Design a protein around this motif. Structure first.
Motif, PDB file in Angstrom:
ATOM      1  N   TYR A 240      -1.431   6.586   3.621  1.00 39.73           N
ATOM      2  CA  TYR A 240      -0.282   6.339   2.739  1.00 39.73           C
ATOM      3  C   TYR A 240       0.117   7.489   1.803  1.00 39.73           C
ATOM      4  O   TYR A 240       1.097   7.355   1.075  1.00 39.73           O
ATOM      5  CB  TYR A 240      -0.482   5.048   1.930  1.00 39.73           C
ATOM      6  N   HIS A 241      -0.628   8.596   1.831  1.00 38.71           N
ATOM      7  CA  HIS A 241      -0.376   9.738   0.941  1.00 38.71           C
ATOM      8  C   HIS A 241       1.081  10.134   0.922  1.00 38.71           C
ATOM      9  O   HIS A 241       1.683  10.223  -0.147  1.00 38.71           O
ATOM     10  CB  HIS A 241      -1.278  10.923   1.309  1.00 38.71           C
TER      11      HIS A 241
ATOM     12  N   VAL B 104      -3.364   8.477  -6.148  1.00 42.98           N
ATOM     13  CA  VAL B 104      -3.823   9.262  -5.003  1.00 42.98           C
ATOM     14  C   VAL B 104      -4.465  10.569  -5.505  1.00 42.98           C
ATOM     15  O   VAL B 104      -3.774  11.417  -6.065  1.00 42.98           O
ATOM     16  CB  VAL B 104      -2.650   9.550  -4.027  1.00 42.98           C
ATOM     17  N   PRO B 105      -5.798  10.716  -5.330  1.00 46.05           N
ATOM     18  CA  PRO B 105      -6.707   9.691  -4.824  1.00 46.05           C
ATOM     19  C   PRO B 105      -7.050   8.673  -5.932  1.00 46.05           C
ATOM     20  O   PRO B 105      -6.684   8.878  -7.094  1.00 46.05           O
ATOM     21  CB  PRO B 105      -7.954  10.503  -4.422  1.00 46.05           C
TER      22      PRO B 105
ATOM     23  N   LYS C 268      -0.661  -0.526   8.201  1.00 46.94           N
ATOM     24  CA  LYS C 268       0.344   0.197   8.966  1.00 46.94           C
ATOM     25  C   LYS C 268      -0.095   0.447  10.423  1.00 46.94           C
ATOM     26  O   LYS C 268       0.669   0.150  11.352  1.00 46.94           O
ATOM     27  CB  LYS C 268       0.683   1.505   8.247  1.00 46.94           C
TER      28      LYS C 268
ATOM     29  N   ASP D 274       3.817   8.443   2.193  1.00 49.22           N
ATOM     30  CA  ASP D 274       4.609   7.296   1.775  1.00 49.22           C
ATOM     31  C   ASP D 274       4.625   7.183   0.259  1.00 49.22           C
ATOM     32  O   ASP D 274       5.667   6.977  -0.343  1.00 49.22           O
ATOM     33  CB  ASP D 274       4.031   5.992   2.366  1.00 49.22           C
ATOM     34  N   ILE D 275       3.455   7.335  -0.353  1.00 50.13           N
ATOM     35  CA  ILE D 275       3.333   7.160  -1.786  1.00 50.13           C
ATOM     36  C   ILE D 275       4.045   8.292  -2.541  1.00 50.13           C
ATOM     37  O   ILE D 275       4.741   8.053  -3.519  1.00 50.13           O
ATOM     38  CB  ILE D 275       1.853   6.995  -2.205  1.00 50.13           C
TER      39      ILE D 275
ATOM     40  N   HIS E 259       0.806  -1.234   0.000  1.00 48.89           N
ATOM     41  CA  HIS E 259       0.000   0.000   0.000  1.00 48.89           C
ATOM     42  C   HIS E 259       0.836   1.280   0.000  1.00 48.89           C
ATOM     43  O   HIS E 259       0.492   2.255  -0.704  1.00 48.89           O
ATOM     44  CB  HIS E 259      -1.031  -0.007   1.125  1.00 48.89           C
ATOM     45  N   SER E 260       1.938   1.270   0.755  1.00 48.49           N
ATOM     46  CA  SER E 260       2.894   2.392   0.785  1.00 48.49           C
ATOM     47  C   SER E 260       3.608   2.611  -0.547  1.00 48.49           C
ATOM     48  O   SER E 260       4.161   3.687  -0.799  1.00 48.49           O
ATOM     49  CB  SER E 260       3.938   2.181   1.889  1.00 48.49           C
ATOM     50  N   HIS E 261       3.596   1.574  -1.379  1.00 46.09           N
ATOM     51  CA  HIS E 261       4.141   1.615  -2.737  1.00 46.09           C
ATOM     52  C   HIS E 261       3.047   1.593  -3.785  1.00 46.09           C
ATOM     53  O   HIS E 261       3.258   1.144  -4.912  1.00 46.09           O
ATOM     54  CB  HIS E 261       5.127   0.466  -2.934  1.00 46.09           C
ATOM     55  N   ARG E 262       1.893   2.138  -3.414  1.00 44.18           N
ATOM     56  CA  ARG E 262       0.719   2.307  -4.294  1.00 44.18           C
ATOM     57  C   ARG E 262       0.309   1.060  -5.081  1.00 44.18           C
ATOM     58  O   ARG E 262      -0.094   1.158  -6.240  1.00 44.18           O
ATOM     59  CB  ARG E 262       0.788   3.597  -5.178  1.00 44.18           C
TER      60      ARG E 262
ATOM     61  N   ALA F 231       5.620   3.569 -14.133  1.00 45.00           N
ATOM     62  CA  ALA F 231       6.308   4.859 -14.106  1.00 45.00           C
ATOM     63  C   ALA F 231       5.416   5.934 -13.530  1.00 45.00           C
ATOM     64  O   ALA F 231       4.225   5.968 -13.833  1.00 45.00           O
ATOM     65  CB  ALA F 231       6.760   5.269 -15.516  1.00 45.00           C
TER      66      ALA F 231
ATOM     67  N   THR G 133      -2.829  14.896  -9.460  1.00 46.36           N
ATOM     68  CA  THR G 133      -3.973  14.461  -8.644  1.00 46.36           C
ATOM     69  C   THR G 133      -3.705  14.603  -7.150  1.00 46.36           C
ATOM     70  O   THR G 133      -4.601  14.970  -6.384  1.00 46.36           O
ATOM     71  CB  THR G 133      -4.453  13.034  -8.967  1.00 46.36           C
ATOM     72  N   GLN G 134      -2.466  14.333  -6.740  1.00 47.87           N
ATOM     73  CA  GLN G 134      -2.054  14.589  -5.364  1.00 47.87           C
ATOM     74  C   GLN G 134      -2.034  16.092  -5.026  1.00 47.87           C
ATOM     75  O   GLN G 134      -2.529  16.499  -3.982  1.00 47.87           O
ATOM     76  CB  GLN G 134      -0.671  14.004  -5.129  1.00 47.87           C
TER      77      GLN G 134
ATOM     78  N   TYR H 289       7.742   7.773  -2.449  1.00 46.34           N
ATOM     79  CA  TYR H 289       8.106   6.693  -3.356  1.00 46.34           C
ATOM     80  C   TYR H 289       8.101   7.114  -4.826  1.00 46.34           C
ATOM     81  O   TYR H 289       9.027   6.792  -5.570  1.00 46.34           O
ATOM     82  CB  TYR H 289       7.211   5.464  -3.134  1.00 46.34           C
ATOM     83  N   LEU H 290       7.073   7.860  -5.237  1.00 50.14           N
ATOM     84  CA  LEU H 290       6.983   8.300  -6.630  1.00 50.14           C
ATOM     85  C   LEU H 290       8.120   9.263  -6.980  1.00 50.14           C
ATOM     86  O   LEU H 290       8.629   9.238  -8.098  1.00 50.14           O
ATOM     87  CB  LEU H 290       5.629   8.966  -6.925  1.00 50.14           C
TER      88      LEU H 290
ATOM     89  N   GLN I 275      -7.847   6.643 -20.645  1.00 54.36           N
ATOM     90  CA  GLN I 275      -7.479   7.546 -19.555  1.00 54.36           C
ATOM     91  C   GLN I 275      -6.344   8.465 -19.973  1.00 54.36           C
ATOM     92  O   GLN I 275      -5.459   8.056 -20.742  1.00 54.36           O
ATOM     93  CB  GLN I 275      -7.057   6.740 -18.329  1.00 54.36           C
TER      94      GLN I 275
ATOM     95  N   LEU J 231      -5.342  17.898  -4.121  1.00 55.49           N
ATOM     96  CA  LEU J 231      -5.891  17.751  -2.763  1.00 55.49           C
ATOM     97  C   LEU J 231      -5.577  18.936  -1.846  1.00 55.49           C
ATOM     98  O   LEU J 231      -6.129  19.051  -0.753  1.00 55.49           O
ATOM     99  CB  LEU J 231      -5.429  16.433  -2.127  1.00 55.49           C
TER     100      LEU J 231
END
Ligand SMILES: O=C1N=C(NCc2cccs2)S/C1=C/c1ccc2ncccc2c1
Lengths: 298, 257
Positions: B3-4, A155-156, A279, B6-7, A120-123, B133, B141-142, B10-11, B53, B145
């Motif tokens: 997870y916002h 996200v989202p 988590k 964290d994600i 989840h932390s890595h989408r 990727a 999109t993030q 990561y990206l 999309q 928010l």
């Protein structure tokens, strides 16, 4: 890269979300491996394989199956994985009634939550968590496997594929046709699996979507706006749904202590927003005395 | 939202690893930035035709740019690469990807099904199956928010600007997706509401208006010159009510930085 010359097939293990899984041996290093065979003579490389390979190459974690290599192409595509012991479904089928002690269950849940939190932390949504897609070794480890139905989320989230998740383990937001689902669907599945390890039977073994829903309602109570705001406006909600009272968790999972019951309830919350994340679950008091017990050898 | 952060972290890590080679067109003996502009514009039409999309489009472009970063391609084969990339992006991202025969169809039968399938394999091999990727769209999109409050025109305009960036490898190939998204969001926000790249995002991203300035100056010029650009498919697309007709909005004349 990687070459099929160096592997000796041992036996067919079974069939996953896609492809066929074989046990094999690296003839040069001695490593026992799993091979997932996909036949390319069916439209090019399947989306399931493209997604699993891409995502598993990213996901390096002790509780996620290790993708070692991809051998391509010979009209066939082979994924090479580390070989563990057995999937959890077979383990449970091979276990005597008393064969899966609560400390092993606690350890397995703790590790599955770690693996899931990492996804989840890595989408990544897994979207097919059930005993057959979970793998144990002889040393106490359990790992998430078969990412054929997984996807990389945003996200989202946007709307993704509707159903999704093998029926017994499918979240109520999916059954009720919500336009958006997210990480909570994987937590629901793990809650079901937790209950199943404890009681040694499937929590909600429905045969159709309506049967599945009614089974969930008989255990958790029929959801209303007080318990799950927005529920009565969901696409497949029906005013005619029968009303059932929530059951006591001491009766849903008798062998379980107070902390265990608390965690299970948080994992099976109707509202995906209130449903516990993987988590946050890791710090639940249920895991205060967690260890890493070994399973039987079958 | 558990997870916002964290994600996003990561990206940011992955976008550096997924970034195409900034100077690859100069190492391509037969193709040019102009031909690439033509290709990407065509993929926009494909995306429109099959109602794909926006994310799918951004992905295919990433795949093309990464492929061309190590593989020399003749001009006659550039569309084949693009078609195979769009097929791969569709399989990765779409609920209902178009069939292979449909991708063969829109190449106007220049290439056969077998060529499209063989190119699919080659692209996969060259990218070593690493298809997840980060895109400008994923950052946007993030960033959305953080609106106070949410504005449909701002969102579609930012998407429009980010999409325009896909067309022109010079200069956009030198900027990371998270930076183009930041510039697009600021410029959209400024055009519609007069507001600016907000403090919550400075702090989330580490990007200041100043760090976004170089991309923002380029994107500003691109936005101003958009009606004059040789490729027009993105402008035509963003006239639609689906995207709130944001390509009809007037670009601001100055940014006042
Ligand atoms: O075990 C795996 N299961 C997959 N999908 C569902 C299936 C369960 C059993 C047969 S098919 S993919 C997969 C790979 C894998 C990796 C390591 C293993 N170690 C021991 C036993 C099975 C293994 C399977």
């Amino acid at each position: 890269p990687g070459s099929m010359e160096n592997f000796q097939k041992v036996e067919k293990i079974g069939e996953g979300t896609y492809g066929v899984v074989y046990k094999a041996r690296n003839k040069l290093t001695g490593e026992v491996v799993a091979l997932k065979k996909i036949r390319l003579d069916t439209e090019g490389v399947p989306s399931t394989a493209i997604r699993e390979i891409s995502l598993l190459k990213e996901l390096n974690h002790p509780n996620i199956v290790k993708l070692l290599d991809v051998i391509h192409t010979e009209n066939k595509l082979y994924l090479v994985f580390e070989f563990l012991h057995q999937d959890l479904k077979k383990f449970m089928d091979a276990s005597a009634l008393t064969g899966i002690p609560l400390p092993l269950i606690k350890s397995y849940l703790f590790q599955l939550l770690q693996g899931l939190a990492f996804c989840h932390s890595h989408r990544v949504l897994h979207r097919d968590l059930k005993p057959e897609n979970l793998l144990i070794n002889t040393e106490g480890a359990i790992k998430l496997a078969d990412f054929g139905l997984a996807r990389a989320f945003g996200v989202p989230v946007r709307t993704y594929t509707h159903e999704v998740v093998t029926l017994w383990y499918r979240a109520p937001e999916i059954l009720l046709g919500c336009k958006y689902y997210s990480t909570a669907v994987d937590i629901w599945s793990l809650g079901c699996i937790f209950a199943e390890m404890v009681t040694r039977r499937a929590l909600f073994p429905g045969d159709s979507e309506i049967d599945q829903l009614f089974r969930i309602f008989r255990t958790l109570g029929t959801p209303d706006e007080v318990v799950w705001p927005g529920v009565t406006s969901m696409p497949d909600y029906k005013p005619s749904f029968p009303k059932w009272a929530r059951q006591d968790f001491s009766k849903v999972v008798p062998p379980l202590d107070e902390d265990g019951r608390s965690l299970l309830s948080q994992m099976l919350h109707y509202d995906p927003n209130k449903r516990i994340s993987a988590k946050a679950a890791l710090a639940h008091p249920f895991f205060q005395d967690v260890t890493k017990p070994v399973p039987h050898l079958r | 939202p558990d997870y916002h952060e964290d994600i996003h972290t990561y990206l940011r890590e992955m976008e550096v690893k997924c970034k195409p080679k900034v100077g690859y067109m100069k190492k391509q003996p037969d193709i040019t930035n102009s031909m690439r502009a033509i290709l990407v514009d065509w993929l926009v039409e494909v995306g429109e035709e099959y109602k794909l999309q926006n994310e799918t489009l951004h992905l295919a472009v990433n795949y093309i740019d990464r492929f061309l970063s190590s593989m020399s391609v003749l001009r006659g084969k550039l569309q084949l690469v693009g078609t195979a990339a769009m097929l791969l992006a569709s399989k990765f991202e779409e609920i209902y990807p178009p069939e292979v025969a449909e991708f063969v169809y829109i190449t106007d039968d220049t290439y056969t099904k077998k060529q499209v399938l063989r190119m699919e394999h080659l692209v996969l091999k060259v990218l070593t199956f690493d298809l997840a990727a980060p895109t400008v769209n994923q950052f946007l999109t993030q960033y959305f928010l953080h609106q106070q409050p949410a504005n449909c025109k701002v969102e579609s305009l930012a998407m429009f600007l980010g999409e325009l960036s896909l067309i022109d490898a010079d200069p956009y190939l030198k900027y990371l997706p998270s930076v183009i998204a930041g510039a697009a969001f600021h410029l959209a926000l400024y055009t519609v509401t007069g507001q600016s790249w907000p403090e919550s995002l400075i702090r989330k991203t580490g990007y200041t208006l100043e760090s976004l300035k170089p991309c923002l100056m380029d994107l500003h010029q691109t936005y101003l010159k958009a009606p004059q650009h040789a490729q027009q498919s993105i402008r035509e697309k963003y006239k639609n009510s689906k995207y709130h007709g944001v390509s009809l909005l007037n670009p601001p004349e100055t940014l006042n930085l």
